[PDB]
Design a protein around this ligand. Structure first.
Ligand SMILES: COc1ccc(C[C@H]2NC[C@H](O)[C@H]2OC(C)=O)cc1
Ligand SMILES: [K+]
Ligand SMILES: [K+]
Ligand SMILES: [K+]
Ligand SMILES: [Mg+2]
Ligand SMILES: [Mg+2]
Ligand SMILES: [Mg+2]
Ligand SMILES: [Mg+2]
Ligand SMILES: [Mg+2]
Ligand SMILES: [Mg+2]
Ligand SMILES: [Mg+2]
Ligand SMILES: [Mg+2]
Ligand SMILES: [Mg+2]
Ligand SMILES: [Mg+2]
Ligand SMILES: [Mg+2]
Ligand SMILES: [Mg+2]
Ligand SMILES: [Mg+2]
Ligand SMILES: [Mg+2]
Ligand SMILES: [Mg+2]
Ligand SMILES: [Mg+2]
Ligand SMILES: [Mg+2]
Ligand SMILES: [Mg+2]
Ligand SMILES: [Mg+2]
Ligand SMILES: [Mg+2]
Ligand SMILES: [Mg+2]
Ligand SMILES: [Mg+2]
Ligand SMILES: [Mg+2]
Ligand SMILES: [Mg+2]
Ligand SMILES: [Mg+2]
Ligand SMILES: [Mg+2]
Ligand SMILES: [Mg+2]
Ligand SMILES: [Mg+2]
Ligand SMILES: [Mg+2]
Ligand SMILES: [Mg+2]
Ligand SMILES: [Mg+2]
Lengths: 352, 201, 190, 109, 136
RNA sequence: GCGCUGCGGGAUGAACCGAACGCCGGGUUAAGGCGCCCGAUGCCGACGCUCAUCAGACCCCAGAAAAGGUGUUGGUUGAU
RNA sequence: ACGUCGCUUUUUGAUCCUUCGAUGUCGGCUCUUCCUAUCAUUGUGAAGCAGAAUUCACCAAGCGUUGGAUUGUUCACCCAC
RNA sequence: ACCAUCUGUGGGAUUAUGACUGAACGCCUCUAAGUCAGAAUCCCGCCCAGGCGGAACGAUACGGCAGCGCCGCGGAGCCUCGGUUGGCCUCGGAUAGCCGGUCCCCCGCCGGGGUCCGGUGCGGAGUGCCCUUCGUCCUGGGAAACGGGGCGCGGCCGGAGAGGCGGCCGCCCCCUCGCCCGUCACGCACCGCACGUUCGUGGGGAACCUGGCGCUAAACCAUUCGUAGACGACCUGCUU
């Protein structure tokens, strides 16, 4: 018979399965649509969740009760040292999807990037790309690389740069660099290759990818919680105290028929450490890293036009469980997924 | 007969072509079907779209991941039609099914091969001119096929190349008709032998 | 039954040139060129005469339904002959009780913006079909002139305007507000 | 040298729908798609030529991998050029869809 | 667009059936499916014959509908359809097919030797025209 | 008739349709079929009727009525 | 209205085919899914539709349909949103 | 922890319906052919997972004379799986129509269009075309001599949808045989008989010998980390 009282289902079936993410680094499942009219530009960036503080600002929202009034808004600090472009990858549109056409790497690869290629760097001979790099010097290699760039020019429709973070500038135990592909939008494919070739081995600051007052998306892996019951994983109503055999359960996991447990019923299992893509996280401040100017160290990235105090974004005593933020950072309104020290993928908005 | 039978799917009716293909793969005879997007289905489009939407509703209730797989590509739709016409739960049927290759558009290497039609399944032959029919390409595009535009772009490229090849053939054939007229005295006697036995008219 | 033969013949003015590419009809006249494709109807089109031309539509062995398209094609061709000689002029009138309907023409008759329909702050942007020019009448107020060569394009453009100004959630027997087609005519008078 | 035999496919065994008679085979011969065209092939020797692991004696040659099951076309089957054939041993089911050689002898033309 | 019409006097070539490969004249039309045909000079007596086995030719005789076979024969011989039909490429294509199916084993050998030679003389002249056009 | 009974057909099924049974070869059928599963129409089968945005599709048998249609196809009675 | 044709298995009956070397019985609670003969919400047609409100009908089950007093209650009834 | 705080989205075909043009039915008609607007529905996108599904790229095992790669279609032999018994190297498509070939105009030696001329039961035809196997000798005509044959060499161009293939040029060597019809005889002619003929120097697993060229790694465990965790798994660090 029908359930006496109507009630919404507990949880969303659009985030199934609730399994531990197969990847630790956030993956850009969809890059922004390419408008050839736009200038050549990167669409994503990698940052690290340092921690959260709060700000005070005046709101210009006509018709609101906070119009021309000051509010306190929580913000998240994402440390974004410049990324190094170490490769270009081309994609061809096929009736089976997008296919990796050709990959060209730069001549010089840092040990930060090279650590990504090894499970045990300590025991390795660090031979990765040792023979590949000679292509940039040998005459035969130079022609072969030019054939690759021309073939990518002629056949590829999607051009992406392979860039890596600089883990040496971060206060983390990890020295292995997170590498990712960042799509290059704008311009023609020929302009994409010309633009990407110049950036090879170069650094790209975060302020060249994102701007002030921009709605961006944050992609990353949520905080892991381990094995969780239905009460915590799916937020099902707790059963009465008198319940025998335990009460942190779902009482009925299905009708007699169909004679199988359905996939839509709440079950115990892994909670957290799920890949997620939150959107419309506004950029409040693109902070500058510590700078050495004419002998002295400039670190007043937390000073505003109304609080001229010479202080850094670092809270007194440093960010808890993260460290000190000395590089460029992005101040995002609200919270984002992941623990402290979690690598986050910052993507431009897919929407208008 | 040929080792591999390459069939152009354009202008053909889905079920009629599937019946012919299913028999051939059961008799050995590796078959390759191309341009499955060009396959037609009898009846107006909306009726056929309703039929396939009704197919999407069939999912295992307890676990749709195990339930029927709704393949959106015109190639896979035709492939599933053929599978329904085979004993695909036996080794004989499975081996027969492996002998069939289906492609949307004409991929290499079959784009530079002569493609054969099946007049018993051709729409111009099997359907009255006043009956409505549906295109498998449009039907698939509206049930979740993503690569209608990419296939259409690549097919236009292939057709450009095939016309250059045809212009070359017409040039070569015009020259061969010129060649025969020049050397007609030297091949007169050989021409009569062909004419005597009906090899020429 | 299946009738053996059913044909209707349409005359052609001396200033009009019609060429046939199979079932495609190309009509050329002083006002321009109109092309229509009739590949969806299995009929035979022929041109008769040399000093004065004449188009004939033939249908062999058709059922009752196939029989009906013979006059349909002939009427379509006569409309095309009308379009390239005299054109089509669909006059629309704006009817309003209280709030006047303000129509401004943009992009040389290609975009029609309708304002203050029923007092709404919503501006209606209606895009004319290609080859159709909309204008505001100068002789009489509250009147729009739609001019084009294809009756179907001109009339569909008028239909788009008419259904743009639709009263909702109100008794439409009262609230007779909108822009309505008042006259169907030709740019030139014979 | 040349083919000297006609190509045929072991389509399957004589059968209804739920009963199979393995002592009789059904053959499809290329070029023969009408019943009236099967009269040439009636009585012709049929061979299922396959290979195994062990060597077996070869008439007029050295032992090799090749083995043959010998048969003969017995009658036409249906209206579509199929023929019935009986082989000295019942054809193995693995041969369905494979090649059967239809010889040109015993000749009567 | 049509050029060949079923009418009284139209000469049709029978494709299949008892009289396959013969010419007949349409004497009258029974209904939409059958016509009254009569080949007096082609050894096909007057009888009904469906349009499905008839292939219209470009020959029309002048005699009134349902006329006696005598007047059909007179018109057939007056226009002399038999020789005119034989002169057409349609008939020549037919007789070429009969010859080709009639080829004995020796004839097939002789035709092939002629093919190994004629196609080869044509091939060289084609190559010469390739080279001549390239220079020009 | 089933029960006591297999077998061909009816997808499947105690009763339906054919037919009742030693172990086999050849031939031919019944009821039932012959697009493909799946043996057989791969006949240049015959004459129509029907378009369904819930078409229809074979005893038992496994879905439908009153009522209505200016859909279409025949036919009846009148009338100009 | 008098008549008359139906559909459903959400009531009760009728029957006794299955289960008596046993298929745990009412109600609630918890939870999922499904049906539509749609209460609301999206798009609409009609009115004895001036507006507002309301009623009838169509596409339509995507989404929602609650907090309590009495009662073991299903069902009722009332308070309030 | 709504007991604090942040974020939640774009298309498409269309339903109902309302229409356009328009016959059936000289009028009319949203429908018959044709066409338009159209929604919490539907399908896709966004988002979650990622096939007994692919892709691109890196590094590929040393003082042992070891392991390996590639070439030399290098030499044999072995075990093991067998199927097959010439090729077709491609316009687009129309079907109440189509195909081929030319003289003029414009897109720039192209291509398109307008005439004109042929073909159309498709003969510039898949009911088709191509190739062809007995070999050799003597010997004469044709045909050819702008010729054949060589992972023989080097170079160039084209092909990315799954290119995994195709063509051209330069040179060197070699033969003037190759293909039609003739002269001339010979080959085990194995004494009527089956699995013969081909792809093919087939695919696979090894174990040798042989010459040249080329390479000297990483994974896992253990340890550590705690962005992770029931255990596995997962993120990390380990002489600049
Ligand atoms: C009056 O309500 C009831 C009467 C009987 C039963 C039990 C039976 N139901 C089916 C079986 O025959 C038997 O089940 C068992 C385990 O004995 C349950 C409720
Ligand atoms: K319930
Ligand atoms: K043997
Ligand atoms: K019981
Ligand atoms: Mg409910
Ligand atoms: Mg994606
Ligand atoms: Mg208790
Ligand atoms: Mg879905
Ligand atoms: Mg999907
Ligand atoms: Mg109201
Ligand atoms: Mg209005
Ligand atoms: Mg008993
Ligand atoms: Mg008895
Ligand atoms: Mg019995
Ligand atoms: Mg049975
Ligand atoms: Mg049944
Ligand atoms: Mg028997
Ligand atoms: Mg019978
Ligand atoms: Mg059956
Ligand atoms: Mg069969
Ligand atoms: Mg009543
Ligand atoms: Mg009971
Ligand atoms: Mg029990
Ligand atoms: Mg029991
Ligand atoms: Mg139980
Ligand atoms: Mg309760
Ligand atoms: Mg309903
Ligand atoms: Mg629901
Ligand atoms: Mg109580
Ligand atoms: Mg909360
Ligand atoms: Mg829309
Ligand atoms: Mg109208
Ligand atoms: Mg409508
Ligand atoms: Mg629309
Ligand atoms: Mg062999």
């Amino acid at each position: 018979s029908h359930r006496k009282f109507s009630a919404p289902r507990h949880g969303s079936l659009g985030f199934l399965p609730r399994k531990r993410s197969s990847r630790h680094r956030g993956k850009v499942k969809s890059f922004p649509k390419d408008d050839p009219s736009k200038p050549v530009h990167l669409t994503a960036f990698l940052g690290y969740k340092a921690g959260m503080t709060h700000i005070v600002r005046e709101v210009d929202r006509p018709g609101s009760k906070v119009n021309k009034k000051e509010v306190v808004e929580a913000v998240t600090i994402v440390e974004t040292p410049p990324m190094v472009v170490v490769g270009i990858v081309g994609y061809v549109e096929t009736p089976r999807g997008l296919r990796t056409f050709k990959t060209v790497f730069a001549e010089h690869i840092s040990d930060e990037c090279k650590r990504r290629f090894y499970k045990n760097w300590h025991k390795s001979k660090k031979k990765a790309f040792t023979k590949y790099c000679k292509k940039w010097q040998d005459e035969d290699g130079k022609k072969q690389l030019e054939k690759d760039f021309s073939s990518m020019k002629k056949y590829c429709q999607v051009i992406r740069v392979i860039a890596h973070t600089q883990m040496r500038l971060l206060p983390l135990r990890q020295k292995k660099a997170h590498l990712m592909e960042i799509q290059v939008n704008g311009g023609t494919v020929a302009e994409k290759l010309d633009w990407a070739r110049e950036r090879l081995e170069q650094q790209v600051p975060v302020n060249q990818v994102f701007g002030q007052d921009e709605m961006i998306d944050v992609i990353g892996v949520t905080k892991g919680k381990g094995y969780k019951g239905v009460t915590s994983r799916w937020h099902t109503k707790k059963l009465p105290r008198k319940t025998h055999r335990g009460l942190r359960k779902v009482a009925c996991i299905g009708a007699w028929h169909p004679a199988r447990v359905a996939f839509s019923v709440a079950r115990a299992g892994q909670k957290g450490y799920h890949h997620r893509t939150e959107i419309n996280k506004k950029i409040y401040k693109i902070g500058q890293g510590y700078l050495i100017k004419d002998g002295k160290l400039i670190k007043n990235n937390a000073s505003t036009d109304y609080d001229l105090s010479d202080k850094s974004i670092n809270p007194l005593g440093g960010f808890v469980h993260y460290g000190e933020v000395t590089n460029d950072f992005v101040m995002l309104k609200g919270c984002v997924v992941g623990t402290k020290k979690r690598v986050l993928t910052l993507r431009k908005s897919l929407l208008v | 007969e040929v080792q591999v039978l390459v069939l152009d799917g354009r202008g053909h009716l889905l079920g009629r072509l599937a019946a012919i293909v299913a028999k051939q793969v059961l008799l050995g005879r590796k078959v390759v079907v191309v341009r499955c997007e060009g396959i037609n289905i009898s009846g107006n489009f909306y009726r056929n779209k309703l039929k396939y939407l009704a197919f999407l509703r069939k999912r295992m209730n307890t676990n749709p991941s195990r339930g029927p797989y709704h393949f959106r590509a015109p190639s896979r739709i035709f492939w599933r039609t053929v599978r329904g016409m085979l004993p695909h739960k036996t080794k004989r049927g499975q081996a027969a099914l492996d002998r069939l290759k289906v492609f949307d558009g004409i991929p290499p290497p079959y784009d530079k091969k002569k493609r054969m039609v099946v007049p018993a399944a051709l729409k111009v032959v099997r359907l009255k001119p006043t009956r409505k029919f549906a295109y498998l390409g449009r039907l698939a595009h509206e049930v979740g096929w993503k690569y209608q535009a990419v296939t259409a772009t690549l097919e236009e490229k292939r057709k450009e190349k095939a016309k250059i090849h045809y212009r070359k053939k017409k040039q070569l054939m015009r020259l061969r008709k010129q060649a025969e007229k020049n050397v007609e005295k030297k091949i007169d006697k050989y021409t009569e032998v062909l004419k005597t036995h009906g090899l020429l008219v | 039954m299946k009738t053996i033969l059913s044909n209707q013949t349409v005359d052609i003015p001396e200033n009009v040139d019609i060429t046939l590419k199979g079932r495609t009809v190309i009509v050329k006249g002083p006002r321009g060129t109109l092309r229509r494709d009739f590949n969806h109807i299995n009929v035979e089109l022929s041109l008769l005469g040399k000093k004065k031309k004449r188009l004939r539509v033939d249908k062999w062995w058709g059922n009752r339904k196939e029989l009906a398209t013979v006059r349909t094609i002939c009427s379509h061709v006569q409309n095309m002959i009308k379009g390239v000689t005299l054109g089509f002029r669909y006059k629309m009138r704006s009817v309003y009780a209280h709030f006047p309907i303000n129509v401004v023409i943009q992009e040389n008759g290609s975009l029609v913006e309708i304002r203050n329909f029923l007092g709404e702050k919503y501006i209606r942007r209606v895009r004319m079909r290609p080859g159709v020019a909309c204008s505001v009448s100068q002789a009489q107020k509250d009147e729009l002139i739609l001019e084009g060569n294809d009756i179907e394009l001109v009339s569909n453009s008028a239909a788009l305007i008419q259904q743009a100004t639709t009263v909702k959630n109100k008794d439409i027997r009262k609230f007779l507000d909108g822009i309505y087609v008042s006259e169907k005519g030709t740019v030139q008078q014979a | 040298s040349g083919r000297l035999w006609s190509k045929a496919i072991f389509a399957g065994y004589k059968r209804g729908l739920r009963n199979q008679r393995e002592h009789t085979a059904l053959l499809k011969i290329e070029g023969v798609y009408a019943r009236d065209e099967t009269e040439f092939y009636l009585g012709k020797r049929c061979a299922y030529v396959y290979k195994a692991k062990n060597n077996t004696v070869t008439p007029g040659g050295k032992p090799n991998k090749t083995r043959v099951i010998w048969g003969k076309v017995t009658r036409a089957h249906g209206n579509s050029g199929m023929v019935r054939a009986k082989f000295r041993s019942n054809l193995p089911a693995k041969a369905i869809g494979h090649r059967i050689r239809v010889m040109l002898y015993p000749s009567r033309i | 667009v049509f050029r060949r019409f079923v009418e009284v006097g139209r000469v049709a070539y029978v494709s299949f059936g008892p009289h396959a490969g013969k010419l007949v004249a349409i004497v009258d039309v029974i209904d939409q499916n059958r016509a009254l045909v009569d080949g007096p000079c082609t050894q096909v007596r007057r009888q009904a014959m469906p349009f499905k086995c008839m292939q219209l030719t470009d020959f029309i005789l002048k005699f009134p509908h349902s006329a006696h076979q005598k007047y059909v024969r007179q018109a057939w011989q007056k226009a002399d359809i038999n020789t005119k039909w034989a002169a057409t490429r349609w008939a020549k294509k037919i007789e070429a097919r009969e010859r080709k199916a009639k080829m004995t084993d020796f004839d097939r050998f002789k035709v092939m030797k002629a093919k190994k030679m004629r196609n080869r003389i044509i091939k060289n002249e084609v190559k010469k025209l390739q080279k001549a056009a390239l220079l020009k």
